[PDB]
């Protein structure tokens, strides 16, 4: 048998944390130490998360009504002796343990989407007096560097950097900022324009060559396209070697195509060929890309087989039956690949997307009500 | 604020050296409240060699409150002089990490990893 001992006072510093298989693998990895880290914005209010170098878990405390004792083996200074009575089902004691902790709760860990804390970071639209406007704000405290941002965000380093690149994060005059859609697209256009004019390798762009190409023949005082702006644009529309960037050309073409949809066929339809003409005409001269209407799936619909018109998902109903109804009213017959991105967000319970469509629609391969 | 989890000590002990972990720890669970005296110091003076209910370990007065007997998955717990509880050794679906939160330096150290627990969820029985 095992002798059970208890201290008169437990240490509440000992706590139970749920270890997911991945968390367990990380913790049980002798190769590296300090791979997991508790992070919080503040001590008294904000949530605490557990982060590796590329993943984030949210902590949740859960109280229970049972007695849970954390006990450890100890070597008695003196032999533990007591008179044995009529104890049956009890063998001779061979071991002593002492309850050193008494927990009333567990700390559960749930995998969660790491996110950036974008509280104090302003939006940059390419103004020339941006430094002044920020300096004349109510909140003087400004996030200086990206390291500070990641440090004070509920996310891992890799998640943070990825999101920062995805949202067009940048820095102007020493203050971190987020480029507006307008300025992002303008900076992209200027970058592409300059890239063609200097015959830069679109598969191997760097910050210095691109920035120099952009600000070569313009005054510094009137040039908002700094090295950081260029680097941001590259980190948004290109992919860097794990050294140099290569443009995501179909993605760029898609962006221009969405803009084109919003500009030319908003509220009105138009032959696909002519729209292709306008779309292509939006690009900087000699820019290498082959456009196709399929790039714009989820951003358009076809009133007729030879016409195209813009549609925003935000204007669609949130109830499945109604959304399918209005989509089918706008267009009687759909191609299978065209309606999916318009209705995917409504699949909350999770199933096969084809079956999901089957519930409200039928094939005949095109799609009908 | 932010701080890394230190698992170096646990790692070293794990590499070196029943349900008891190699580090010599276990988790006991009882569906109820373990009623112990509020004053160990007073009762330790009345403790007779026959009873052996109290002892001193590393400057702490420990009470011997029961006995545990493990038979495979089955487990039996004797509490006090008059209680017997039947329970089981169950494998945790989600392994539990025991961590020590040092408030002084705001440092966290991995103490151990619990994969099993000895649980008693049924009403206590007479000693025989």
């Amino acid at each position: 048998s095992i002798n059970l001992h208890s201290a008169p006072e437990y240490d509440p510093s000992y706590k139970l944390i749920q270890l997911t298989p991945e968390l367990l693998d990380i913790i049980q990895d002798p190769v590296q130490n300090h791979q997991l880290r508790f992070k919080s914005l503040d001590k008294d209010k904000s949530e605490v998360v557990l982060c590796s170098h590329d993943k984030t878990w949210v902590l949740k405390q859960r109280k229970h009504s049972n007695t849970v004792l954390l006990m450890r083996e100890f070597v008695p200074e003196q032999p533990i002796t007591f008179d044995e009575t009529l104890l049956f089902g009890l063998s001779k004691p061979y071991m002593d343990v002492v309850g050193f902790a008494k927990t009333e709760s567990e700390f559960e860990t749930r995998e969660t989407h790491g996110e950036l804390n974008l509280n104090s970071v302003p939006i940059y639209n390419g103004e020339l007096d941006f430094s002044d406007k920020i300096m004349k704000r109510s909140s003087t405290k400004v996030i200086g560097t990206l390291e500070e941002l990641l440090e004070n965000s509920p996310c891992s380093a890799l998640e943070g950097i990825s999101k920062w690149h995805k949202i067009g994060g940048s820095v102007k005059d020493g203050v971190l900022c987020i480029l507006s859609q307008d300025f992002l697209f303008k900076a992209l256009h200027v970058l592409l324009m300059s890239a063609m004019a200097e015959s830069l390798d679109l598969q191997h762009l760097n910050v210095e060559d691109t920035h120099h190409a952009v600000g070569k023949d313009i005054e510094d005082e009137f040039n908002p396209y700094t090295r950081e702006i260029i680097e941001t644009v590259l980190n948004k529309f290109a992919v860097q070697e794990q050294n140099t960037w290569r443009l995501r050309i179909p993605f760029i073409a898609q962006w221009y195509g969405i803009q084109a949809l919003r500009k030319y066929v908003s509220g009105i339809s138009m032959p696909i060929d002519e729209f292709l003409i306008k779309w292509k005409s939006l690009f900087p001269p000699f820019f290498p890309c082959d456009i196709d209407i399929d790039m714009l799936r989820g951003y358009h619909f076809k009133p007729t087989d030879k016409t195209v018109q813009y549609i925003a998902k935000s204007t669609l109903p949130m109830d499945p039956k109604e959304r399918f109804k209005v989509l089918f009213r706008l267009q009687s017959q759909w191609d299978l690949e065209d309606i999916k991105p318009l209705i995917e967000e409504l699949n909350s319970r999770g199933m096969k997307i084809d079956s999901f469509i089957m519930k409200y629609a039928r094939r005949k391969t095109v799609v009908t009500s | 604020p932010s701080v890394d989890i230190d698992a170096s000590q646990w790692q070293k002990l794990t590499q070196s050296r029943t349900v008891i972990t190699p580090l010599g720890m276990m988790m006991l669970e009882i569906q109820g409240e373990l009623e112990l005296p509020k004053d160990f110091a007073s009762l330790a003076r009345r403790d007779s060699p026959n009873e052996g209910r109290f002892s001193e370990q590393d400057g702490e007065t420990l009470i011997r409150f029961g006995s545990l007997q493990i038979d495979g998955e089955r487990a039996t717990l004797f509490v006090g002089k008059k209680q017997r509880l039947l329970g089981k050794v169950t494998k945790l679906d989600v392994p539990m990490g025991i961590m020590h939160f040092n408030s002084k330096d705001n440092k966290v150290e991995l103490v151990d990893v619990m994969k099993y627990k000895v649980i008693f969820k049924d009403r206590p029985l007479p000693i025989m």
Binding site: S13, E47, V48, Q61, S65 | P1, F101, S103, N106
Partner: peptide, 27 residues
Amino acid sequence: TVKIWVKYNEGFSNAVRKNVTWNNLWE
């Protein structure tokens, strides 16, 4: 005489999960 025993809880209850702050870990 020393009195040691278990007050049996008829069942088991789990409270609602709660958020965790920095002070919750380091009390």
